[PDB]
Structure 1
Amino acid sequence: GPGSMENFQKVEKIGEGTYGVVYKARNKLTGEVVALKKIRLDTETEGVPSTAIREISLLKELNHPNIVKLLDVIHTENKLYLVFEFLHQDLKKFMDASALTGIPLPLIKSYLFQLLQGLAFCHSHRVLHRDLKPQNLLINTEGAIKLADFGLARAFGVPVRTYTHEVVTLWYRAPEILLGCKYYSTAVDIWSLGCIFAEMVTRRALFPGDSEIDQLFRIFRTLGTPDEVVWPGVTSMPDYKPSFPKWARQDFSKVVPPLDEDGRSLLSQMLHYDPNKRISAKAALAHPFFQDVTKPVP
């Protein structure tokens, strides 16, 4: 629409997605730096991929400071280019390259606060993200962090229907998905932010399982094996098995020892078994953990 590839100057590759490569480019008329996600259709036999149709349609309508902006979509000849705003790095690269002595608590607190704002905006616009992980969270030089990669995202209805199973990168996947539940909702995105919260503190994933059952087991060893009291219905869930080992819930202060009381409170509510009890992004913004929050720079 408002643009053609004549006006972009490629700068360097910055990444790779399921359907192509991402470049950093420069608008030669305005100066603006962007990310071009190329999607090829010439080498597509089922027309425009469903991932791109969702990514584009859903991002069009999510205008918010903590959701990366789709600036444009260009259909050249046999090709489809998504123009996105440019951010310098993702959260995973930052915890790995500049958080050796750690991420300072103000910056964790600022980032989690912004993530919750973005996700609340998603959920208020009937959109599940379904792949929140540090790789998919983009940071700028001004202290902003933004949800990105909406390729697995989905417009939901109220109430929710059965959607695609086995969504969410495994380390970030909620128990209700692992147990094969008929329905999942906005709480699966909170579970992911919960894992991410912990990961920002430690710089290591909280539950790095190598299979569905190993993931469950790791969750259960940390938070205790759930039962009917903590999670009504759990024992009747499709992939629940009675033979599941029954691990005791360890004291939460031992799960992320550097975390203060408010942090632990918030984290515990993000990682509640029961999706009904699990805190929403909207309610989380008011949690005392954020009482003193600011927006400092990377």
Structure 2
Amino acid sequence: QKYEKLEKIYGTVFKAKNRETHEIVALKRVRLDGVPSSALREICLLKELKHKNIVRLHDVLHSDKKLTLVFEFCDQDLKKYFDSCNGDLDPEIVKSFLFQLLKGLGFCHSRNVLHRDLKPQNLLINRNGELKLADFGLARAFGIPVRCYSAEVVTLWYRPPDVLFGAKLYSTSIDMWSAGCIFAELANAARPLFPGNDVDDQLKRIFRLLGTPTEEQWPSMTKLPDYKPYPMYPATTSLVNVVPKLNATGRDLLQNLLKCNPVQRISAEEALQHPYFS
């Protein structure tokens, strides 16, 4: 109640002033009548993920049979940012954004958390130029030898091929692929790099550009629940075609992030220690 709702941006999001301390936050408000369990997980994880590049969770209120997560406030999501400016970002912004994402993401992995929902809309950006990871609704902790997780993670266009192939078990490499996609988006007209209409289509666009995986490069792929032998499309690996506002060094990183075989994906640490960053 110590809040003042304003323009209205799980449940619905609101901007607000603490009214008492005058600070502006963002309220989520979750209806308590699976959504709740997802919300309680986000809260649990966030409480243990404090980093300038990870959205902060100030409080959590239980009122009127609703849970209101009092979050810090960010000017806009990266998706809207892409609309703010248009078709282009100074190659320097591209670097900054990837850096902070890679840093905020590298942190989650170190604290044993998979975000599993990395897409432009879940990346917050302040006018001050800083970027923060948000919406951990799909996140989860990992460490305990689990039989498997779930394959219903990550929006279609950022879903890595292994998961598309029905893989139920995955590692931190899963957020790395999404990161690569976001990078591609970052360094171009800001349009998604692989916008399929369904799983089958998603796979095609990916292999059509990266080249279809061969059992040699990705041995365990055929053993996946929903694996399908797609035509061996050439490897248009001359990514330059698909990402011009990016040097040759940068393209090298984008290539290590977009490896179809999960195991071949660079980690956040490595990514950050990559030449592209100086």
| TM-score, normalization by structure 1 | 0.89
1:40-79 to 2 correspondence within 5 Å?
40-41=31-32, 44=33, 49-79=36-66
Name the residue aligned to 1:120.
Answer: 106
AA aligned opposite 1:127: V
Runs of 4+ aligned residues of structure 1 deviating over 3 Å after TM superposition are 158-161
AA aligned opposite 1:149: D
Which of 195, 209, 217 does residue 208 from structure 1 map onto? 195
AA aligned opposite 2:118: L
Task: Give the Cα separation in 1 of the matches to 2:124 and 2:134.
Answer: 7
Name the residue aligned to 2:181.
Answer: 195
Q: Residue 12 of structure 1: SS of its match in structure 2?
A: coil
Q: Which runs of 5+ in 2 are unaligned?
A: none
Give the paired residue count. Answer: 276
Which of 256, 260, 266 does residue 253 from structure 2 map onto? 266
Q: Which runs of 5+ in 1 are unaligned?
A: 292-298
AA aligned opposite 1:40: R
Superposed CA offset, 1:112-143 (max 9, x none) = 00001111111111111111100010001111
AA aligned opposite 1:220: F
Task: Give the Cα separation in 1 of the matches to 2:202 and 2:137.
Answer: 23
Is residue 116 of structure 2 the alignment partner of residue 130 of structure 1? yes
Task: Give the Cα separation in 1 of the matches to 2:215 and 2:268.
Answer: 26
Deviation at 1:71, TM superposition (A): 0.3
AA aligned opposite 1:62: L
AA aligned opposite 2:6: V
Deviation at 1:239, TM superposition (A): 1.8
Which of 3, 12, 33 does residue 21 from structure 1 map onto? 12
Is residue 64 of structure 2 the alignment partner of residue 82 of structure 1? no
Q: What do you get for the CA RMSD once the two structures are aligned? A: 1.4
Task: Give the Cα separation in 2 of the matches to 1:79 and 1:235.
Answer: 46
Task: Give the Cα separation in 1 of the matches to 2:168 and 2:150.
Answer: 10
Superposed CA offset, 1:249-296 (max 9, x none) = 1123223233211111110000011211100011111111111xxxxx
Query: Does the CA-based 8 Å contact 1:160-1:185 persist in structure 2?
Result: no
The percent identity for this pair of structures is 59
Deviation at 1:69, TM superposition (A): 0.2
Name the residue aligned to 2:134.
Answer: 148
Name the residue aligned to 1:281.
Answer: 268
Task: Give the Cα separation in 2 of the matches to 1:182 and 1:24.
Answer: 37
**Counterparts in 2 of 1:158 and 1:104: CA distance versus 1, 3 Å:** farther
AA aligned opposite 2:52: P
Task: Give the Cα separation in 1 of the matches to 2:94 and 2:231.
Answer: 34
Deviation at 1:78, TM superposition (A): 1.3
Deviation at 1:99, TM superposition (A): 2.7
Name the residue aligned to 1:290.
Answer: 277
